[PDB]
Design a protein around this ligand. Structure first.
Ligand code: NI
Length: 341
């Protein structure tokens, strides 16, 4: 049944709760972002109000065929009224269109639901600074101290330098980037920019990117694979068999692949720096795993929560095992004792 951490007390609301059928008492279904574990269950047959960002609303209409009369897009950073309750959507620094939701309950309680987010100090100057939050529904994906990773800026610098060097040494190399959902567009767009190429992709992915309000996107992406030297493929296909196969398909226009797999975390991060990453190579194919994360590191998450000082924390990730839950609750107590709230 619908878990408690998907329900907003004192309202008829749920968050990211589309795979349970009709949730009893739910008058408004919010969707934080367009990732399949969160939207799972939506289709053209859904007839309840869905509240989301403009970008998420474009993807619901164009990719899932949800009928327009049930899509309620809200602007960001704007106080809005939903079934009598004041709400605000905030940028979550996750994938395009991803939001955090602030609920102002009639009784005076203020609730923040982070959806999926990558905490950042810029958040400390949004509408969040203006009032107290009593309950925080927190994206705890990486809530353990082993999870460190570099800034997004450092990772894109490594990728741009690597690609530029490879293609300048060999003008017949192809760059390939893996994807399985929206998010991490900076990876392939930054590489294409430094090489003076558009990114080539399938018609289905091109359609997806045209939903995102990314400025000048017509200038950066294309469905013509041949004219392009940065290709996007399903993440599944980013391996030696998949890549040897793809290389056949270009008809000897290319003699070398350099491929990027933007993973979240992998255990080379506890040891290795970004400057010290190496690929896996077979023949004329090299694969680089780069730690480009759209979720908070442990230290980013800890800073955000010690700034906000919530009265109660409700984890939304890693909640399925007793040892995970108990470990997270021990970190929350450390944070509160160190900070004095
Ligand atoms: Ni997500």
């Amino acid at each position: 049944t619908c878990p408690f951490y998907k329900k907003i007390p004192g309202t008829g609301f749920t968050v990211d709760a589309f795979q349970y059928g009709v949730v009893e008492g739910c008058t408004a279904y919010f969707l934080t972002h367009f990732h399949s574990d969160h939207y799972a269950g939506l289709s053209k047959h859904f007839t309840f109000p869905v509240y989301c960002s403009e970008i998420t609303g474009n993807l619901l209409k164009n990719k899932l065929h949800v009928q327009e009369q049930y899509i309620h897009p809200l602007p960001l950073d704007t106080e809005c009224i939903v079934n009598g309750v004041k709400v605000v959507l905030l940028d979550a620094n996750h994938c395009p269109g991803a939001v955090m939701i602030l609920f102002y309950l009639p009784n005076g309680t203020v609730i923040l639901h982070t959806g999926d987010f990558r905490a950042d100090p810029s958040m400390e100057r949004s509408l969040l600074a203006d009032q107290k939050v009593h309950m925080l529904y927190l994206d705890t994906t990486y809530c353990s101290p082993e999870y460190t990773f570099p800034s997004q800026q450092e990772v894109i610098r490594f990728a741009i330098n690597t690609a530029f060097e490879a293609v300048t040494l060999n003008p017949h190399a192809l760059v390939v980037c893996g994807t399985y959902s929206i998010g991490k567009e900076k990876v392939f767009l930054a590489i294409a920019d430094v090489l003076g190429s558009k990114v080539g992709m399938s018609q289905e992915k091109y359609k997806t990117l045209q939903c995102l309000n990314i400025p000048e996107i017509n200038s950066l992406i294309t469905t013509d694979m041949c004219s392009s030297l940065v290709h996007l493929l399903p993440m599944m296909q980013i391996n030696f068999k998949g890549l040897q196969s793809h290389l056949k398909k270009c008809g000897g226009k290319y003699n070398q692949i350099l491929a990027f797999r933007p993973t979240g975390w992998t255990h080379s991060n506890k040891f290795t720096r970004i400057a010290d990453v190496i690929p896996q190579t077979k023949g004329n194919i090299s694969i680089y795993g780069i730690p480009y994360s759209e979720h908070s590191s442990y230290l980013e998450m800890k800073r955000f929560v010690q700034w906000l000082k919530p009265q109660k924390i409700i984890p939304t990730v890693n909640v399925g095992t007793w040892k995970s839950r108990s470990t997270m609750e021990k970190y929350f107590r450390e944070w509160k004792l160190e900070a004095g709230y």
